[PDB]
Design an enzyme around this catalytic site. Structure first.
Site, short mmCIF file in Angstrom:
data_model
loop_
_atom_site.label_atom_id
_atom_site.label_comp_id
_atom_site.label_asym_id
_atom_site.label_seq_id
_atom_site.Cartn_x
_atom_site.Cartn_y
_atom_site.Cartn_z
N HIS A 1 -58.77 -21.56 28.79
CA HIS A 1 -59.33 -21.01 27.57
C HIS A 1 -58.26 -20.99 26.49
CE1 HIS A 1 -61.58 -18.71 24.76
NE2 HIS A 1 -60.86 -17.62 24.91
N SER B 1 -61.05 -17.80 20.43
CA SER B 1 -62.33 -17.34 20.99
C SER B 1 -63.20 -16.53 20.05
CB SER B 1 -62.10 -16.49 22.24
OG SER B 1 -61.92 -15.13 21.89
N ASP C 1 -63.09 -25.41 29.43
CA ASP C 1 -62.84 -24.02 29.06
C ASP C 1 -63.88 -23.13 29.73
OD1 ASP C 1 -62.83 -21.48 27.71
OD2 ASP C 1 -61.89 -22.39 25.95
#
EC number: 3.4.21.-
Length: 472
Positions: A442, A180, A415
């Site tokens: 995610h 991320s 996601d």
């Protein structure tokens, strides 16, 4: 303790699997002031079991998330071949977890008191309350940290730290896996030290050229999509607390969480009963739901939490919210929440325009009705970064790193936190490869999928990139 200039990392066994070693690296707080204040970065190192290529350095995202903790987690799911060829290395970014100084703004009580509030009243009075709380939060950050450390916690400086880590590990070139937010570390490193990049895996992508409001709304849509997939799955299962008709799931969901707010005074909490003394506020219910939508592995817990709410109980949703906030069983918070804000607020220009914020709320309510209460009021609060006392150290722009080695961006089709298309865009800017994972979660790398992990292993070891259109 770590000596301010390139003193080698003194490694010592951590006090823990795999002969792990631990040590600290000194970096300057201000790289334009190398004789100034120093930060000490905490490192963890799991030595390779075979022929060592180098270190695989990871970052788990957030920001504010501990890389040491994530390395300990990743160690358990690391493919045998990666464990053979690489030292697995985690680090806590400047200001995070075991690194020093650590960003701290709120006491445990400050956090608890905020979570007890419904956080639903967006009348003028409610907006003023929220923004007063926000100003007091910022004051606490300044008081505990000072403006100089706050000014320099951003990703532009983490990327420079990362090159110092590369050199301190004895690696000529960096092999990097970022999740991320960690893909912003990755692309920032790629821009400043392109000649040092051996390999990069970027799972769950941040597009550094995004408009902050449109990215937030895309994230709101991602969580509504995830909510929709959770609820359509739930509808096939006996006793689904959202009912058997997924077109009505958002409605039924609100029939369960809305009673946690006094219907005649939106500032008054009516918390669901828990064994914990706090009970379950509306805001914690929403946060716990958001937590569960990070992975189908947590959908059963969301179902348990909503079934409890049918009976006006809130224990599972409260525990999910505690997991999101990283509040442990003794009521102690780690510093991830405070670090996350402080880092986010310097990584791009904050949104300060009231009309844009009000319009964002108007749209978010339509895009993600599961997490909005009541009706659009015509007002909405500015975010914390609008009051930040220290300026941004990065500006949105498309990644430009023309000499960069091929890299792999992993992007999951549904996601919620870093949507699929953001990975497509980041891979385009890097001129790298896009590896697609079909799922509602995610991130995915080193988390139980052999198709993903086989692609990643072959790239880390042999430099082989997935073919165009590769899917898992």
């Amino acid at each position: 303790a770590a000596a301010a200039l390139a003193q080698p990392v003194e490694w010592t066994p951590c006090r823990i699997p795999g002969g792990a070693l631990c040590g600290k690296l000194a970096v300057p707080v201000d790289y334009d002031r190398p004789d100034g204040d120093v930060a000490a970065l905490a490192l963890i190192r799991f030595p390779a079991t075979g022929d060592k290529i180098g270190s695989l350095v990871i970052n788990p995202g957030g920001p504010g998330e501990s890389g040491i903790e994530a390395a300990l987690g990743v160690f358990q799911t690391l493919p045998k071949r990666v464990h053979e060829r690489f030292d697995l290395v985690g680090f806590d970014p400047r200001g995070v977890a075991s690194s020093r100084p650590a960003i701290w703004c709120n006491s445990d009580a400050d956090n608890d008191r905020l979570r007890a509030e419904p956080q639903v009243d967006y009348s003028r009075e409610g907006v003023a309350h929220i923004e007063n709380e926000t100003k007091q939060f910022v004051g606490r950050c300044v008081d505990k940290m000072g403006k100089n450390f706050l000014a320099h916690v951003g990703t532009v400086n983490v990327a420079k730290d990362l090159d110092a880590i590369r050199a301190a590990l004895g690696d000529d070139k960096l092999t990097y896996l970022g999740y991320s937010y960690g893909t912003r570390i990755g692309s920032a490193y790629a821009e400043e030290f392109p000649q040092r990049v051996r390999a990069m895996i970027l799972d769950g992508a941040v597009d550094p050229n995004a408009d902050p409001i449109e990215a937030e709304l895309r994230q709101a849509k991602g969580f509504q999509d995830a909510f929709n997939n959770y609820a359509a799955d739930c509808a096939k299962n006996a006793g689904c607390p959202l009912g058997a008709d997924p077109a009505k799931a958002v409605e039924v969901y609100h029939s369960l969480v809305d009673p946690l707010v006094d219907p005649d005074n939106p500032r008054i909490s009516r918390p669901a009963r828990t064994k914990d003394p706090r009970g379950l506020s509306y805001s914690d219910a929403i946060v716990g739901t958001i937590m569960a939508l990070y992975s189908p592995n947590l959908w059963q817990h969301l179902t348990d939490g909503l079934s409890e709410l049918v009976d006006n109980r809130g224990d599972t949703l409260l525990a999910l919210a505690d997991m999101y906030m990283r509040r442990d069983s003794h009521g102690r918070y780690n510093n991830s929440g405070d670090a996350r804000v402080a880092i986010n607020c310097v990584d791009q220009p904050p949104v300060t325009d009231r009309d844009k914020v009000i319009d964002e709320d108007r749209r978010a309510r339509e895009i993600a009705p599961f997490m909005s209460y009541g009706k659009f009021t015509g007002d909405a609060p500015l975010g914390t970064c609008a009051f930040w006392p220290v300026p941004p150290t990065s500006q949105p722009h498309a990644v430009s790193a023309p000499g960069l080695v091929p890299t792999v961006v992993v992007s999951t089709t549904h996601d919620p936190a870093t949507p699929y298309k953001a990975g497509v865009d980041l891979a385009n800017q890097l001129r790298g490869s896009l590896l697609t994972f079909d799922g509602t979660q995610h991130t995915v790398v080193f988390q139980g999928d052999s198709c993903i992990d086989e692609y990643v292993t072959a790239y880390l070891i042999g430099g082989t990139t997935p073919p165009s259109g590769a899917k898992c």
